[PDB]
Amino acid sequence: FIQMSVQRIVEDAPPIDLQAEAEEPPRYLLKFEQIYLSKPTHWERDGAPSPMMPNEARLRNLTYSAPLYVDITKTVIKEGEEQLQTQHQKTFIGKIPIMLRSTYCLLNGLTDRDLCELNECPLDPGGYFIINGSEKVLIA
Amino acid sequence: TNYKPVANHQYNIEYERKKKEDGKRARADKQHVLDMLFSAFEKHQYYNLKDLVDITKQPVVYLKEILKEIGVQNVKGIHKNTWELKPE
Amino acid sequence: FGVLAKIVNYMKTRHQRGDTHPLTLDEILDETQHLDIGLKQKQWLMTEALVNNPKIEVIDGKYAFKPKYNVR
Amino acid sequence: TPASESSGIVPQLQNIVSTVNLGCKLDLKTIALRARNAEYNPKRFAAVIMRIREPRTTALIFSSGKMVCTGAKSEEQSRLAARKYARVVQKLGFPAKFLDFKIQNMVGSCDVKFPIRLEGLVLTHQQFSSYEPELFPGLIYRMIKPRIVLLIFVSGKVVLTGAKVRAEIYEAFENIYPILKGFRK
Amino acid sequence: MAYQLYRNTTLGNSLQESLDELIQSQQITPQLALQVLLQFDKAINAALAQRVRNRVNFRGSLNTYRFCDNVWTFVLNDVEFREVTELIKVDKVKIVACD
Amino acid sequence: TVPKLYRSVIEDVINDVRDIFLDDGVDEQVLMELKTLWENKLMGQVEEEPLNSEDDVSDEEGQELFDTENVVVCQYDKIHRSKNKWKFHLKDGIMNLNGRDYIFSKAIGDAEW
Amino acid sequence: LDLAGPLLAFLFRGMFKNLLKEVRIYAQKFIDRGKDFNLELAIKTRIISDGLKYSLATGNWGAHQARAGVSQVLNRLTFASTLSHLRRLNSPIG
Amino acid sequence: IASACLYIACRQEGVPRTFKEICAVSRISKKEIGRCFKLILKALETSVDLITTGDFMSRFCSNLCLPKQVQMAATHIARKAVELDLVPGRSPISVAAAAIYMASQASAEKRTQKEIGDIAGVADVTIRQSYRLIYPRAPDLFPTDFKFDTPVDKLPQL
Numbered sequence: 001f002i003q004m005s006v007q008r009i010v011e012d013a014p015p016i017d018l019q020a021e022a023e024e025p026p027r028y029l030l031k032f033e034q035i036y037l038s039k040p041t042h043w044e045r046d047g048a049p050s051p052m053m054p055n056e057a058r059l060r061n062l063t064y065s066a067p068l069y070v071d072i073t074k075t076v077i078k079e080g081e082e083q084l085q086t087q088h089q090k091t092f093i094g095k096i097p098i099m100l101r102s103t104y105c106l107l108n109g110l111t112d113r114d115l116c117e118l119n120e121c122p123l124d125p126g127g128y129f130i131i132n133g134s135e136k137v138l139i140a
Numbered sequence: 141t142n143y144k145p146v147a148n149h150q151y152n153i154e155y156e157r158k159k160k161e162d163g164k165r166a167r168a169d170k171q172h173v174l175d176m177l178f179s180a181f182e183k184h185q186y187y188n189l190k191d192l193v194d195i196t197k198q199p200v201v202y203l204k205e206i207l208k209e210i211g212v213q214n215v216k217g218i219h220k221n222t223w224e225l226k227p228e
Numbered sequence: 229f230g231v232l233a234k235i236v237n238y239m240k241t242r243h244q245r246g247d248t249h250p251l252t253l254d255e256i257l258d259e260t261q262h263l264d265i266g267l268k269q270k271q272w273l274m275t276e277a278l279v280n281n282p283k284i285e286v287i288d289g290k291y292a293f294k295p296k297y298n299v300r
Numbered sequence: 301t302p303a304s305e306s307s308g309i310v311p312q313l314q315n316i317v318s319t320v321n322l323g324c325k326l327d328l329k330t331i332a333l334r335a336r337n338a339e340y341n342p343k344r345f346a347a348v349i350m351r352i353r354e355p356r357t358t359a360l361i362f363s364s365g366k367m368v369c370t371g372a373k374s375e376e377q378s379r380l381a382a383r384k385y386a387r388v389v390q391k392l393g394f395p396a397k398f399l400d401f402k403i404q405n406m407v408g409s410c411d412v413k414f415p416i417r418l419e420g421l422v423l424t425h426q427q428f429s430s431y432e433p434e435l436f437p438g439l440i441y442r443m444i445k446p447r448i449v450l451l452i453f454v455s456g457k458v459v460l461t462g463a464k465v466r467a468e469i470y471e472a473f474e475n476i477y478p479i480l481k482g483f484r485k
Numbered sequence: 486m487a488y489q490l491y492r493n494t495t496l497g498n499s500l501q502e503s504l505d506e507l508i509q510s511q512q513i514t515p516q517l518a519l520q521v522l523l524q525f526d527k528a529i530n531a532a533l534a535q536r537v538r539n540r541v542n543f544r545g546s547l548n549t550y551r552f553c554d555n556v557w558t559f560v561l562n563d564v565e566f567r568e569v570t571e572l573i574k575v576d577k578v579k580i581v582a583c584d
Numbered sequence: 585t586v587p588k589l590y591r592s593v594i595e596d597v598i599n600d601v602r603d604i605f606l607d608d609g610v611d612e613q614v615l616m617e618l619k620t621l622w623e624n625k626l627m628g629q630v631e632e633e634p635l636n637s638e639d640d641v642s643d644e645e646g647q648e649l650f651d652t653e654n655v656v657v658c659q660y661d662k663i664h665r666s667k668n669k670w671k672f673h674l675k676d677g678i679m680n681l682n683g684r685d686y687i688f689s690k691a692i693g694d695a696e697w
Numbered sequence: 698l699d700l701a702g703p704l705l706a707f708l709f710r711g712m713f714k715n716l717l718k719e720v721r722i723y724a725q726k727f728i729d730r731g732k733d734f735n736l737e738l739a740i741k742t743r744i745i746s747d748g749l750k751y752s753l754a755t756g757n758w759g760a761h762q763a764r765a766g767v768s769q770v771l772n773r774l775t776f777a778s779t780l781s782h783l784r785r786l787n788s789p790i791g
Numbered sequence: 792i793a794s795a796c797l798y799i800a801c802r803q804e805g806v807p808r809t810f811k812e813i814c815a816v817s818r819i820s821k822k823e824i825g826r827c828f829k830l831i832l833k834a835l836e837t838s839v840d841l842i843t844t845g846d847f848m849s850r851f852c853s854n855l856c857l858p859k860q861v862q863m864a865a866t867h868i869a870r871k872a873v874e875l876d877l878v879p880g881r882s883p884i885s886v887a888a889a890a891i892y893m894a895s896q897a898s899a900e901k902r903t904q905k906e907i908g909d910i911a912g913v914a915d916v917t918i919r920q921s922y923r924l925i926y927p928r929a930p931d932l933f934p935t936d937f938k939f940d941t942p943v944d945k946l947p948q949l
Contacts, residue, residue: 488659490657490659491657493655493657494655494657494678495626495680495685496590496622496626499622499623499625499626500594502625503618503619503621503622503625504618506618506621507617507618507621512610512614512615513605513608513615514608517604517605517607517608520604521605524601524604525597525601528593528597528600528601529593529597532589532593532596533676533678533687534676536592537676537687537688537689538689539688539689540688540689540690540691541688541691542692542693543691543693544693544694545693545695546695546696546697547670547695547696547697548645548647549645550670550697557660559656559670559695561695563693563695566679566686566691571681571682573682574682575652575654575682576651576682577649577651577652577654578652578654578656578679578681579650579652579654579655580656580658580674580679581655581656581657581658582659582663582674583659583660584659
C-alpha cells in the first residue's frame with residue numbers, strides 16, 4: 001500500500017484543470033509527481049521534529065503517523081505566450097499511519113539489542129497501527 | 141514547507157496591480173453612456189452592472205445614479221435580471 | 229440613432245428648464261454640437277420613426293410636450 | 301513650579317496638520333487647470349494637492365471646500381499658511397473664505413541625550429506600552445490624561461504624536477521624563 | 486500607439502505650417518488636412534519608441550509643477566543636460582509629459 | 585543629430601502617408617512641394633474678511649513667460665518626489681533646450697521645489 | 698481477503714479525491730477574482746491524516762455504515778492472543 | 792482576525808511564532824496581521840509578554856538539524872549578547888539568527904547564511920549585520936565547554 005499503491009492513486013488522478021472565468025483569460029494546470037514519505041515524526045509544542053518512537057506514542061497517546069509529501073507542478077499558460085513551469089517541490093499533504101515493524105517504521109531494520117534500547121519487545125510481531133495510543137489491528 | 145514570507149507573492153502582485161488605478165474612479169461624460177448601448181444592446185438587451193462597468197471606466201454608484209435616469213432593471217427577464225432601457 | 233436618443237435626453241433637460249417652447253431640430257443639433265448634412269436627413273428618417281412612437285412627445289409643429297400629466 | 305530643576309529638553313515641534321473650510325463648494329478640475337504649483341489625479345486621491353514654499357508647507361484642497369494643510373513648524377505659521385492657501389484659491393477666481401480654522405494634530409520630536417532600555421519599561425508600565433520589535437523598532441506609549449501617543453526609541457529620542465495645543469504636548473515630555481529616567485542605561 | 490503630445494514639436498509645427506498654406510491654395514482637398522497629422526502621429530511614434538537607442542541625464546531646479554488630468558508639466562530651470570557639455574543654463578525648461 | 589533623424593522620419597512618414605493622400609491622389613510632386621516645404625521652412629476669527637490686508641501672501645515667483653520654447657515633449661514612466669527633491673524616470677525625450685533641439689530615449693535627474 | 702493494503706487504499710482514493718476537490722474550489726475562488734493562488738495554501742492537510750486516523754480508530758470504512766468492526770484494539774492477554782488477533786478473518790454475513 | 796488570534800494564542804502559551812510564520816500559513820499579509828494583533832490587544836484589554844531570543848531557539852536549530860550542543864551554545868550566546876547590550880534595539884529573531892550562525896560556523900555541523908535566514912525569518916543582510924555586531928566579543932560570548940571544529944580564531948568574518 002505504501003510503496004506501490006499511494007503513488008498509483010496519486011499519479012492516476014486527472015490533472016486539475018482550471019481556467020479563469022472572470023481575451024483567453026489565464027489557464028492553470030496542476031499535476032502530481034512522485035510521493036515522498038518520511039519517518040514517523042513528532043512535533044512538540046515548540047515545533048521541533050523529533051523521531052516518535054512507538055513506546056512513546058503508546059505512553060503519550062499519540063498516533064504513529066508519517067508525513068506524506070508529493071511533488072506538484074504548476075503551469076501558467078496565458079495569453080498564448082510561454083508557460084511558467086515552477087515545480088513547487090515536496091509539499092506536505094498529510095500523515096499516513098505506519099504499521100509497526102513495517103519497512104517504513106523506525107523499527108524495521110533494528111536488531112534485538114536496538115529494540116531493547118528503544119524499549120520494545122523483540123518478540124512483538126508487528127502489524128498493528130498506533131492510533132491515539134491504542135493499538136489497532138485491521139481484521140481481514 | 142510552509143516558509144516565512146513578508147507577504148505572499150500573489151497578494152503582492154494584486155497590490156502592485158492596484159498601484160495602477162482606483163476603483164473609486166472619476167467621471168465627466170454623462171452623454172457618453174448611451175453611445176455604446178446604442179450599438180451593443182443587440183448583444184444584451186439588458187446589460188449587467190458588471191457589463192457596463194468595464195466598457196465604461198466609472199465607479200459603480202455614479203453609473204447606477206445615471207442608470208436610474210436612463211433605463212430600468214429587468215427584474216424578471218428571459219435571459220436574466222438586469223438593466224433594460226427606455227427607448228428614449 | 230444613439231445621438232437621437234441623446235437629443236431626447238437633451239429635450240428632457242429642456243423640460244427640466246421649464247422654458248419649453250415650440251422648437252425644431254436644427255437649433256438643438258447646433259446647441260448639442262452637431263452638424264446639418266445628409267446625416268441629419270437619415271437621422272431625421274429615424275426621428276420620424278421616433279415620431280411614430282414618441283412617448284416622449286416629438287410632434288412636427290408646435291410640440292415636445294412630453295408629460296401625459298403636466299400642470300404647474 | 302517645575303517638577304524637575306533641569307525641567308527637561310522641552311521637545312521642539314516638527315509637523316502640524318490644520319483643517320480649514322473654504323466656505324463654499326469649489327470645483328477642482330478648474331483649480332487644477334489654473335493652479336501653478338499643484339498635482340491632481342482622481343485616481344491617486346480625491347483632492348488637489350498643492351504646496352506653497354513661504355513656510356515650506358504642503359496642503360490639500362477638497363472639492364467640498366474643506367481643506368487641510370500640513371508641514372508647518374509654528375502653529376501660528378500653520379494657521380496663516382492655511383489661510384494663504386485660501387488666498388490663491390480665491391485669486392484664481394473662486395469664492396474662498398476662512399470659516400472654522402482649527403489645528404487637529406501636531407507632532408513633537410525630542411531627545412533625552414541618554415540611551416534607554418525598553419524591556420523594563422514595558423514590563424512595569426505594561427498597561428500602556430506595546431513593543432513588538434518585528435513590527436516596528438520603538439515603544440508605543442499611550443498616556444491617558446495628556447492624550448499623547450509617544451514613540452520611545454532606544455537612542456533616547458522620543459516623538460510625541462497626537463497634540464491638541466502646544467502646552468498639552470509640552471506637559472507630556474516632563475510627564476514621562478521621571479518614568480523614562482529610571483529605565484535607562 | 487500614436488501620441489497627440491507631438492502637436493507642438495518643431496518637426497510637427499513645420500509640417501503643420503506647410504499643410505496650412507498649401508491647402509489654402511487647394512493643392513489638395515480640404516478634408517485631408519487634419520487626417521495627415523493624425524496618421525503622422527503613429528509614424529513618429531514607432532520610430533520614437535523603438536528606433537531611438539540612447540538617453541542622457543540632467544540637473545537643475547523648478548519653479549512650479551503641474552499634474553493636470555494626465556499632463557506632467559514642469560517649470561524647471563534645469564541648468565544642465567550633460568552628456569558632454571550642455572553647460573549653457575537652460576533657463577525655463579518646460580518639461581511636458583503624458584502617459 | 586536632429587537631421588540625422590529627419591533623414592529617416594519625414595521620409596518614412598511620407599512613405600506611409602502615400603496611400604493616405606492617395607485616397608484623393610492629387611499629383612505626387614505637387615504634394616512633394618509641401619512635403620519639402622516642411623524643410624524649406626525648417627531650414628477663524630469673526631473679523632476674517634481681510635484675506636488680503638495687503639495680501640496673505642502673493643506668489644513672489646512670477647514668470648508667466650514660457651521663455652525658452654523647449655516643450656520637452658517626453659512621455660513619463662514615473663516621477664517620484666522626495667522631501668523637496670524630485671526624481672525622474674522620463675522617456676522619449678524630445679526638447680528644444682536653450683533653442684537647441686535634441687531628442688533622446690530616456691532621462692533622469694533631480695530637482696528642487 | 699482484503700487484509701490491510703487494499704482496505705486503506707480505498708480510503709486513500711477517496712481522500713485524495715476530496716483533497717483535489719478542495720484545492721479546485723480554493724484555487725478557483727482565487728483565479729476568478731484575478732489573483733494567482735498559492736498552492737501550499739490550498740492543500741487542506743487535515744483531509745488525508747484525519748480520514749485515515751478516524752477510520753482506523755473507530756473502525757467504519759467510508760458510506761461509513763458500509764463496514765463496521767474492521768479495526769479492533771489488539772488483545773494483550775497472552776502472546777497467543779495477540780498472535781491470533783493479527784491473523785484473523787471475518788465473514789461478511791450481511 | 793483568526794491569524795491574529797492564532798499569533799496571540801501561540802504567544803500566550805510560551806511557544807512564540809514570528810509574524811512571518813503566521814503569514815506563511817495564512818492568506819493575510821504581515822502588515823495586516825500586525826494591525827489586527829494590536830487591535831485585538833487594545834480591544835480585549837490584555838497583554839502578551841516579550842518575545843525573547845530563547846523562545847525562538849529549539850525550533851530554528853532543530854529544523855536546521857543542528858545537534859543539541861550547537862543549540863545550547865546558540866541560546867547561551869544570544870542570552871549573553873542581549874545581556875551585554877551588544878545588540879541595541881534590534882529584533883529578537885535577528886540576534887537569534889546571528890547566534891545560530893555563530894554556533895553553527897563554530898561547530899561540526901555548520902550552516903550557510905542563506906539557509907539560516909531562509910528557515911528562521913530573516914534576510915541575509917540582517918544576519919550579517921547582527922553577526923558583525925556580536926563578532927568582536929567572540930570568545931567571551933560562548934559557553935565554557937565547547938569543541939570548536941574551527942577554533943574561535945577563524946570564526947568566519949562577514
